[PDB]
Design a protein around this ligand. Structure first.
Ligand SMILES: Nc1nc2c(ncn2[C@@H]2O[C@H](COP(=O)(O)OP(=O)(O)OP(=O)(O)O)[C@@H](O)[C@H]2O)c(=O)[nH]1
Ligand SMILES: Nc1nc2c(ncn2[C@@H]2O[C@H](COP(=O)(O)OP(=O)(O)OP(=O)(O)O)[C@@H](O)[C@H]2O)c(=O)[nH]1
Ligand SMILES: Nc1nc2c(ncn2[C@@H]2O[C@H](COP(=O)(O)OP(=O)(O)O)[C@@H](O)[C@H]2O)c(=O)[nH]1
Ligand SMILES: Nc1nc2c(ncn2[C@@H]2O[C@H](COP(=O)(O)OP(=O)(O)O)[C@@H](O)[C@H]2O)c(=O)[nH]1
Ligand SMILES: [Mg+2]
Ligand SMILES: [Mg+2]
Lengths: 429, 66, 426, 430, 426
């Protein structure tokens, strides 16, 4: 009944979705062709054939990454009307994805979202998979937020975004398109899950004992965390955490809504052969600074609100035992004005592993979301990165040439300045 | 006799000084530590009430910590 | 479906494009008859980018092929892949320009730009979406610089949003094939700066160095020369045509590769270059590719990057590989040598990965670079021009067909502006 | 519940640990895979599937003794994280392996004893295994002692170290390595155990019928000795000793903590077919000086404290007879202050014969610990060895280059001189 | 890992190294093609100490080959195991050296030492960790002692904290092969006392006496001499590649053996040497092995240790053992020979027992000595220098290269200095 709509924007979003929907089909009985040989309601609309269509919209301005979905092994699952293809790429330019080429295709994807929500009596929120350092994921998505916050009212907006790593970088203009989107998507989102790329490379190098995995092994982990988020909307549990209480716990203020991601049991097959994983050790490994899915130091920051989503075979007694040892650890700096600070969700369905996957069959799984203040450190780092580009009129001609005023660039800097000064203000005693 | 060319090269190599024969030499601890691997007090068979007391010991240790 | 319209001009451009269409038809499995006979299904999924559909399963290429003297056409047509180009694209004249820029630009050049525009505009408007124009010519010649520059001028005042992508052949340092090419280079650089958005620079003797010292060839002909050009010709549009985990088109390189409109002069490279005598002794992976494309003696220009400063740099990969080796060694080449790269740009390396390798190698790459070291070539062209304009050395075969004498001073005064602008960033 | 964490630093520690852990897996019913086809709790950890990860920390700066384990028959037994390897060598240098390359890896190994102790319901103390001669076992051991003293604290650090022998020696700088490493055993270690080589060589020569003894035959005896002391935590008896109990009964001073460990019924198969290793005849065989595991003369010193741990079919009634026969003798000469000086342990399980070894099993096995003042007369000779080499400052330039001042040899000499008078002043009394 | 980069300089060094690499390939089971041939799985987990991985199951060496004459490189490639080497590591001079130390160090080595440094900088960065270096020399000629010292003086200056165990064939005391040998040997030994931590001393008539009066070889070529030298080479680094009881790498040997920063002239030998007819007449064990090790007719230097004092002694053992015989006999030998061993060190012998033996024998040892009998071999070259130099004989072949006549005075000053420090502990 409680059905959610996922929107994938850009090359990164499409490639994340291509691995998340695999495990979405695998966890239920849905075959790649669409057949199954009521828990599947929240993601798969059931037609009368026994064939299930997904509730997702794949949209990209470059057709090159979407045609492999149309000709791949999932060609008979998606609705062909869903996979929206553009004509010309945005090509790392925010203005090309905002004003001129991105303006033509927003009405079609808006109509598709409306017709997908017409068949949705239990609309709860949005699961947006857009990128920050790209062309269409940062520019085309901002128009989508602009339209949905004025057309669909006060609905939940959960972004699973990719943020640029401090060290590993792909484009050379990505500080621009990262800074540009935060001006208007700050007030047009309710929570934003920040994900980098380098920290997950450390995760698959250090915790996973395999060398040279690819983007697929990273998108598999992103699919796993996005599955554990919506575990309480489809399976029975002791304390089900709906999608609405997530932000009742996490976000305190109308301008601090930027939590963090962490997935603890990421061990391999030979590790599962030897070490047994109960609740306490995976809760301890969850709070490790180096197990984080973002390159940041959590000890510098202060946690403000955290929620735990336990999955599999757990009993509540040692869940309540395991969080008490976190209260007495002075190394973890909790904030002085949140004495409760915790939320617990339980599901009885154990996590599943894809065939040919990287993880192994485990019995317990914990996924962590926490509003911290190290994200302000990451934002100050990106602000310093961008500040050594506007000093001498660099790369502006691509922007002011195509329908973007030069007066935007001065305002976004001071808007982010107010944002980080507010973020550091609330972290004090 | 499937490795005859290796031995034919090695002896014609070192028939000048080092004449011998081909053996296989394992390490010493791979020949000493090997697959070669009633009992009064097979264990202190603590059960039930002793397990309860061990859990008690943990619980009031963390309780007096609090 | 992102469409590229190809132009050639001069005996440079005709032969270089002949090898380019050779290797492209070899990659897509296209016979000399034009029919497909390849194996994989991925060679037909974006076949339309470089070829036009025709009946009979024949893919006629999309390129205009023009040179004033028709003696070069009879060499292309009688070649191995000479029976696939359309004869309507085979536009020519009757009198060759013969190493004079002004001959090809004002008197007879005005008499054939209409005839070649009538086929360029005919092929361009039959396109679903058009990406830009890709042109192959010579800088030191007479019919490349003399005439093909008029085509770029006439296109850019008519298609004011399509990208310009030129592969020019600059004069060599120590050996000169013409005696007049300082004039032609000075007259063509001044007109290529305010119009084109992406220019590539290639030289003959540096590629001789490549096929001698690296490929260990015995008799380096012009065929292997043009094959090495065609390798970096095909590698730049290899993500616009094939699937991969992270693709980049020409506009991605344009926006990641220029900081300012007047700094867009590039220089190319090709990474997996090894001889026959060292084939079995080379470990073909990522680390030696990233250490080889960085090497100064693997480049296609006569300018050491040691003397210049890299502003931004692109690197397009090809094949099947993991992506943290890629980015970790881009980090290594940005961190081992901080004196090679500008400190006022945070990230200077652009990467893009395809999936299908070239026919004959498991892994491959293609280096593109905007360096300040290209200022060392233009200052040499200007010093030749000042040594030649000081007494009007060859000027009377230029003003004899209606040139202004003063325009030579404007050409120098706008050429050294590029040298001044490169020098400010060093 | 009663658990010990083993840290086996250095190559000698790794080899002795391979022998000892083979003995431990043979003592219980654990296959080398990890499956049985509550006595394993001290040295193992039961998992859900029936696996059992041993609690060992195998650390060395070389792969050639750690990857040599990884290709062995116990590759599946050990969790792959605790087989810690290094890159380069300490190379017979206390200074190098303690200051230069030990620093980059001592932050990594310390994160493994933390995870082992987080799985520990109750930890009783550590059991370090290294050697006093080499480079890793003298510098890394000192770093481990100081870091565990800062970190954990009030535990019972057992130290099973191998001492340089008076006559047989391999390294040249091994007096330099052995003298320097006493600055953490004296302060930061709460108990210690010297063993030298030539005593084990002579025991294998004379008590056993074997000649030509390889190094596995030494580590098996050491593993039997260490299995004897920790036998009471796994199997207690009529008179059980505890690891924190015998520490208070073995030191009179916070500085005299260097006992001598013997396993009395070392015996062969042809040798032991004729006699009976009874309670009454192996107790005076515990004090035979050529059965001492340290090549020192106990006739020239006075016994100060003692602790005898039996193992197997022992009745308490003749132990008092054995304790009464010893004190009446004239040669076994004691300290005047303490009249009793004896603590006795009883256990009911006989030793486990290793298939492939030489020690044919007896039923009454006794492990013997004695605090003797004669071991200081085996310490003035090492001081003489260091004095004859420090006269013209030989081998010094390879220590002062690695960020350490030359004068620490001299202050080590003052410490050893001030340590000798502690054994001088005891024994003689009013 | 713990990997060694090899260098071969001069004709003698190249001919010895072409036997060293090729007995090593025998020891690890590598064919002349480069693939695997061995019988055991023990020959591959430590293959990376000497070899580099190549695709296709092939294995290539890690060595740079340097000389001043293409003939020796032709002879190296013409051998049975010459084709395994990479050809881009072959960097050589192409005009002769003249047996001039001055020409091989200043006029001809200065051109070549840059490219050799480039190749060794490429090869040293191809490993995660580098243990140290290894070089084969010849202290009599000019192309194997002129730039090899130049190689070391620009390796210590750039890689300051590693191991260079150079091996040198010292000039003869009684007979000779070049009339300018004392000059080159003194000029090389002036630089081998400063920047080198381990050096070796090899004397050709010791090889001759071993192969005549012990091996009973009627016709000894130079190949057998390099076979003996390479058998000494293989035993030192066996603990790096093969497991054993009491392992000891090169830093172990360095720290134990040489006490002072200057007394590092070694004295190497190989124990189980016997003729064919006497093999079935002797038992094969450690009691006879220690004698054949300590026998001075199994020694590679013509200086009796009876006339001097043994400072420290190493013995790297191989094969199945039982280390009571190893430990107790180094006590027995010191007890009987108390006068020869020094008194201020209690134990002068270090043993290191490995388990995997060389092919052919099970009872193998590598003698390493540090004795004060080196000065009785070094007076015999200081006297030759002081006879040649005082008559002002051969200097214009050195004065013509910019080095003046006074430089030789520091060489003999350091010579008498070294002789003085050897005499302090006699
Ligand atoms: N984690 C992860 N990141 C990806 C993946 N694919 C692309 N990216 C990221 O995307 C960034 C640039 O690609 P995009 O943001 O998708 O570019 P775009 O938004 O599609 O804009 P255009 O390509 O011009 O249409 C890179 O920095 C990558 O880190 C993926 O599969 N997984
Ligand atoms: N019982 C036993 N003792 C050994 C063994 N190997 C070495 N030893 C002893 O160790 C002493 C010296 O220590 P090392 O062998 O250098 O070992 P280490 O202290 O870890 O130093 P490294 O070898 O560099 O790692 C020697 O005197 C030997 O008696 C062995 O395999 N078994
Ligand atoms: N690489 C390459 N260079 C060429 C080829 N043909 C001519 N050139 C170069 O062209 C230069 C001379 O210019 P040219 O082609 O005669 O100019 P044009 O007469 O105006 O077309 C010389 O420097 C040659 O190196 C070719 O097929 N390949
Ligand atoms: N062991 C060995 N020594 C050699 C060989 N060839 C030459 N030598 C030695 O080299 C010495 C002469 O030095 P030389 O090699 O000419 O010096 P170079 O010209 O600088 O390399 C003589 O004393 C020879 O003993 C060889 O094949 N094997
Ligand atoms: Mg895109
Ligand atoms: Mg060691």
């Amino acid at each position: 009944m409680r059905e959610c709509i996922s929107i994938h924007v850009g090359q990164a979003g499409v490639q994340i979705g291509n691995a998340c929907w695999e495990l979405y089909c695998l966890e239920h009985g849905i075959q790649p062709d669409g057949q199954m040989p009521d828990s599947f309601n929240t993601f798969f609309s059931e037609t009368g054939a026994g064939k299930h269509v997904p509730r997702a919209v794949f949209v990209d301005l470059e057709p090159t990454v979407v045609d492999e979905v149309r000709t791949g092994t999932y060609r008979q699952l998606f609705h062909p009307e869903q996979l929206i293809t553009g004509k010309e790429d945005a090509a790392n330019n925010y203005a090309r994805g905002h004003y001129t080429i991105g303006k033509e295709i927003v009405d079609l994807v808006l109509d598709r979202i409306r017709k997908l929500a017409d068949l949705c009596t239990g609309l709860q929120g949005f699961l947006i998979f857009h990128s920050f350092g790209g062309g269409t994921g940062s520019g085309f998505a901002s128009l989508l937020m602009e339209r949905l916050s004025v057309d669909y009212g006060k609905k939940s907006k959960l972004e699973f975004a990719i943020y640029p790593a401090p060290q590993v970088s792909t484009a050379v203009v990505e500080p621009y398109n990262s800074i540009l989107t935060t001006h208007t998507t700050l007030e047009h989102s309710d929570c934003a899950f920040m994900v980098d790329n380098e920290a997950i490379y450390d995760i698959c190098r250090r915790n996973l004992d395999i060398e040279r995995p690819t983007y697929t092994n990273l998108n598999r982990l992103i699919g796993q965390i996005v599955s554990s988020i919506t575990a309480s909307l489809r399976f029975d549990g002791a304390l089900n955490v709906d999608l609405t209480e997530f932000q009742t716990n996490l976000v305190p203020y109308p301008r601090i809504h930027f939590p963090l991601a962490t997935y603890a049991p990421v061990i391999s097959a030979e590790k599962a052969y030897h070490e047994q994983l109960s609740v306490a050790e995976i809760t301890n490994a969850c709070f490790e600074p180096a197990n984080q899915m973002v390159k940041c130091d959590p000890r510098h920051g202060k946690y403000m609100a955290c929620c735990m989503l336990y999955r599999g075979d757990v009993v509540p007694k040692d869940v309540n035992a395991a969080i008490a040892t976190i209260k007495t650890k002075r190394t973890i700096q909790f904030v002085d004005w949140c004495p409760t600070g915790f939320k617990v969700g339980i599901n009885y369905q154990p996590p599943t592993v894809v065939p040919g996957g990287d993880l192994a069959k485990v019995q317990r799984a914990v996924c962590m979301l926490s509003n911290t203040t190290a994200i302000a450190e990451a934002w100050a780092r990106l602000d310093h990165k961008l500040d050594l580009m506007y000093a001498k009129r660099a790369f502006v001609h691509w922007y002011v040439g195509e329908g973007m005023e030069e007066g935007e660039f001065s305002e976004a800097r001071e808007d982010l300045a107010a944002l980080e000064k507010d973020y550091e203000e609330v972290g004090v005693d | 006799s499937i490795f005859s060319d290796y031995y034919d090269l090695g002896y014609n190599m070192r028939s000048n000084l080092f004449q011998g024969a081909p053996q296989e030499t394992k390490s010493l601890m791979k020949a000493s530590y090997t697959p070669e691997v009633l009992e009064h007090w097979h264990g202190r068979k603590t059960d039930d009430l002793g397990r309860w007391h061990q859990k008690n010991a943990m619980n009031m240790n963390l309780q007096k910590a609090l | 479906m992102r469409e590229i319209v190809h132009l050639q001009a001069g005996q440079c451009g005709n032969q270089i494009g002949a090898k380019f269409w050779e290797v492209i038809s070899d990659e897509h499995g296209i016979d000399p008859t034009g029919t497909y006979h390849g194996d994989s299904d991925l060679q037909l999924e974006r076949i339309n980018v470089y070829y036009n559909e025709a009946t009979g399963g024949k893919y006629v290429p999309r390129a205009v092929l023009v040179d004033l003297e028709p003696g070069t056409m009879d060499s292309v047509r009688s070649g191995p892949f000479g029976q696939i180009f359309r004869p309507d694209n085979f536009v020519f004249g009757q009198s060759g320009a013969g190493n004079n820029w002004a001959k090809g630009h004002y008197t007879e050049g005005a008499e054939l730009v209409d005839s070649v525009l009538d086929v360029v505009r005919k092929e361009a408007e039959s396109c679903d979406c058009l990406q830009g124009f890709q042109l192959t010519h010579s800088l030191g010649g007479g019919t490349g610089s003399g005439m093909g520059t008029l085509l770029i001028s006439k296109i850019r005042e008519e298609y004011p949003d399509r990208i310009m992508n030129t592969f020019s052949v600059v004069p060599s340092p120590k050996v000169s094939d013409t005696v007049v090419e300082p004039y032609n280079a000075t007259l063509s650089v001044h007109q290529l700066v305010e119009n084109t958005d992406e220019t590539y620079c290639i030289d003959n003797e540096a590629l001789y160095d490549i096929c001698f010292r690296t490929l260990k060839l015995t008799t380096p002909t012009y065929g292997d020369l043009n094959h090495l050009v065609s390798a970096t010709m095909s590698g730049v549009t290899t993500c616009l045509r094939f699937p991969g985990q992270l693709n980049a088109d020409l506009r991605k390189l344009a926006v990641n590769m220029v900081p300012f409109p007047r700094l867009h002069f590039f220089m190319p490279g090709f990474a997996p270059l090894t001889s026959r005598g060292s084939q079995q002794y080379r470990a073909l992976t990522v680390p030696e590719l990233t250490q080889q494309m960085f090497d100064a003696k693997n480049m296609m220009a006569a300018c050491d990057p040691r003397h210049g400063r890299y502003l931004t740099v692109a690197a397009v990969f090809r094949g099947r590989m993991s992506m943290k080796e890629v980015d970790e060694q881009m980090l290594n080449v940005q961190n081992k040598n901080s004196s090679y790269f500008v400190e006022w740009i945070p990230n200077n390396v652009k990467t893009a990965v395809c999936d299908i390798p070239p026919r004959g190698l498991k892994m491959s790459a293609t280096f593109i670079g905007n360096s300040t070291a290209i200022q060392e070539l233009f200052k040499r062209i200007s010093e030749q021009f000042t040594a030649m304009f000081r007494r009007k050395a060859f000027l009377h075969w230029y003003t004899g067909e209606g040139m202004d004498e003063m325009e030579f001073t404007e050409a120098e005064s706008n050429m050294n502006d590029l040298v001044s602008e490169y020098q400010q960033y060093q």
